[PDB]
């Protein structure tokens, strides 16, 4: 029984070994604690929006959507239908990006490293859509608490359709590399098994629930934008091991493709932000020709909108699990409190139980199957 | 609705057992993976020959900042300080005073590009299209000091990139 | 893709699927980089009457 320190996302891990086995695993976090929640209290809501891109920097628009939904609930407004459809479209695109990241980096840590490039080409393509729609590849800040910042450029939907019609064979090549491979199975099968009761008690969410046979999904049970107007299936695991969660994430990629097709077909016309110039800024032409519009633009970009007092907890089904925000407003344009709940915190808390009586090399597999990004863990 | 990913029961007849035994003993799935990799070897790579080819961009792309001016040649900035107030990172510092002709103009306009997060809030809070975040992205520096822009640097950037800045604003201003 | 027929046959047999149908490199089939101007319709509260703000 020797204690060894795997030091410098970036993680420090203190583990005691009895030979090959692991006896106690202790993750030491805080190497990426920037103090985001305290810095939010010194900003307005619009100024506090870009922090959420950096929270979970693999699934940006999902954090944007969760923050926007919380602020909408506190403001007592609702976005226009086209804004909601665009939000769900880009949320599914973001889910595809996150699942590519998770699976490819998991396999890379295992030692495969070829699907990483195969799928990072598609990640680059998806990046172009983000760049085209907003002007930034990763931290777009596109989804706003009133809707979306701007409308789609005239050629975006055709390119999204052309990209999404060839993605299935990319997933298929990934599955050829990984799904039926015996080395991959021996690396992932029967590793990190967690029971349904223990997964539920420990605060797990997302695949960590679904992999254990629990039939739960926030997009189905508690739909938020237009997710009740689209049809998709929810893959459910049977053994609660790493292999089942890998299969679940791949099937989520396929279901995200299905939802993307539906969202492309049913995109409605109309405006993109709530037509209430005391929350969403007016158009540049209106600001430059009208007096109320200029006053409202000035006040919104200097002071911001005042949110009625109250506290909410708004959660969404982010690609990593339940991502929530507990937002407390004292009645001003500056949030009084913003607690950020990320599934990675609970997953890394459960890491210690998840790695009982396993090899040293299996800890890497467990960390990979939890898909821990330390920006959301440390905040 | 929901799906099952791994509740497939393998057949226990002699043919399926023999197929599984042949798979174990002759490594069929490993050779299948080898075939997939071999197939991927014989197709064209996705690499572009930088710096001769450049990755695609859009008029909405936001890179290095610039301060623009009117066609007469007189700077658009009126020291309203809305870009300074909206800046999430507090990366803009502005000081103003009446000019010799009484114009409302800035005597100091600094952007700390090491504090900037390139969100574009400044260029959308500007009522006169004075501050823009242009399409340049190749401005890496050998020292920290040269990434601290002042009014002269931003004005030079505007004069340098005005052609395609105006082209991009023309292409994208109907969505704003 | 400007690949010879023999190389296409070899890659298709090795992968087991028809690669030329759905290529992962983008070609002239994408949308043009210069587009017509848009119009972007107005919202529902852009009325000139019966549009008092206290009601919305």
């Amino acid at each position: 029984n020797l204690t060894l320190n795997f030091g410098p996302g970036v993680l420090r891990l203190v583990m005691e070994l009895s030979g090959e086995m692991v006896r106690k695993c202790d993750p030491h976090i805080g190497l990426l604690h920037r103090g985001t929640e305290k810095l939010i209290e010194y900003k307005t809501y619009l100024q506090a929006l870009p922090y959420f891109d950096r929270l979970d920097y693999v699934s940006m628009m999902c954090n944007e959507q969760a923050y926007s939904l919380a602020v909408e609930k506190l403001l007592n407004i609702q976005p226009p239908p086209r804004a909601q459809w665009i939000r769900v479209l880009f949320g599914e695109i973001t889910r595809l990006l996150n699942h590519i990241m998770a699976v490819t980096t998991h396999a890379l840590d295992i030692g495969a490293m070829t699907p990483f490039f195969w799928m990072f080409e598609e990640r680059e393509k998806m990046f172009e859509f983000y760049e085209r729609v907003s002007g930034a590849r990763m931290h777009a800040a596109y989804i706003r608490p009133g809707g979306v910042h701007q409308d789609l450029p005239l050629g975006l939907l055709d390119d999204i359709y052309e990209f999404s019609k060839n993605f299935s064979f990319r997933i298929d090549e990934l599955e050829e590399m990984l799904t039926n491979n015996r080395i991959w199975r021996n690396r992932t099968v029967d590793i990190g098994v967690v029971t349904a009761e223990d997964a539920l008690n420990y605060g797990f969410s997302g695949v960590m629930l679904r992999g254990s046979g629990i039939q739960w999904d926030l997009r189905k049970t508690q739909p938020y934008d237009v997710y009740d107007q689209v049809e998709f299936d929810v893959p459910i695991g049977s053994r609660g091991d790493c292999y089942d969660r890998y299969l679940c994430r791949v099937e989520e990629m396929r279901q995200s493709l299905r939802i993307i097709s539906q969202c492309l077909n049913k995109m409605p016309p109309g405006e993109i932000k709530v037509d209430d110039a005391k929350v969403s800024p007016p158009k540049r032409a209106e600001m430059k020709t009208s007096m109320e519009s200029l006053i409202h633009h000035f006040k919104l970009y200097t002071e911001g909108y005042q949110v009625p007092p109250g506290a909410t907890y708004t959660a969404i089904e982010a690609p990593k699990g339940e991502f929530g925000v507990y937002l407390v407003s004292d009645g001003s344009s500056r949030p009084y409190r913003c607690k950020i709940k990320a599934p990675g915190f609970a997953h890394l808390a459960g890491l210690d139980k998840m790695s009982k009586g396993h090899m040293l090399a299996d800890v890497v597999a467990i960390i990979g199957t939890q898909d821990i990004v330390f920006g959301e863990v440390d905040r | 609705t929901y799906k099952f990913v791994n509740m497939r029961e393998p057949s226990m007849d002699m043919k399926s057992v023999t197929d599984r035994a042949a798979q174990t003993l002759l490594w069929t799935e490993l050779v299948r993976g080898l075939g997939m990799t071999l197939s991927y070897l014989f197709r064209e790579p996705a690499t572009i020959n930088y710096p001769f080819e450049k990755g695609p961009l859009s008029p909405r792309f936001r890179g290095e900042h610039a301060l623009r001016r009117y066609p007469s040649g007189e700077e658009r900035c009126i020291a309203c300080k809305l870009c300074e107030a909206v800046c999430p990172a507090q990366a803009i510092t502005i000081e103003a005073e009446p000019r010799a002709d009484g114009s409302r103009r800035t005597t100091r306009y600094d952007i700390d590009m090491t504090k900037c997060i390139y969100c574009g809030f400044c260029q959308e809070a500007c009522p006169v299209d004075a501050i823009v975040e242009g399409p340049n992205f190749e401005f890496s520096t050998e020292t920290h000091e040269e990434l601290l822009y002042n009014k002269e640097k931003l004005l030079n950037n505007g004069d340098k990139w005005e052609a395609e800045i105006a082209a991009n604003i023309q292409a994208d201003y109907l969505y704003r | 893709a400007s690949a010879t027929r023999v190389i296409q046959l070899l890659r298709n047999w090795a992968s087991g699927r028809d690669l030329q149908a759905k290529l992962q490199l983008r070609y002239q089939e994408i949308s043009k980089r210069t587009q017509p101007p848009p119009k972007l319709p107005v919202g529902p509260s852009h009325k000139l009457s019966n549009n008092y703000y206290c009601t919305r």
Binding site: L154, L157, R254, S261 | - | -
Partner: peptide, 29 residues
């Protein structure tokens, strides 16, 4: 005057998109 023009799906929608897993069998006992 001008009529509304924004990004919309074409008339009749887009073509079907394949999403099911496609793992063929080469075939040998």
């Amino acid at each position: 005057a001008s009529k509304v023009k924004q990004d919309m799906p074409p008339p009749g929608g887009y073509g079907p998109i394949d999403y099911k897993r496609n793992l063929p069998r080469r075939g040998l006992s």
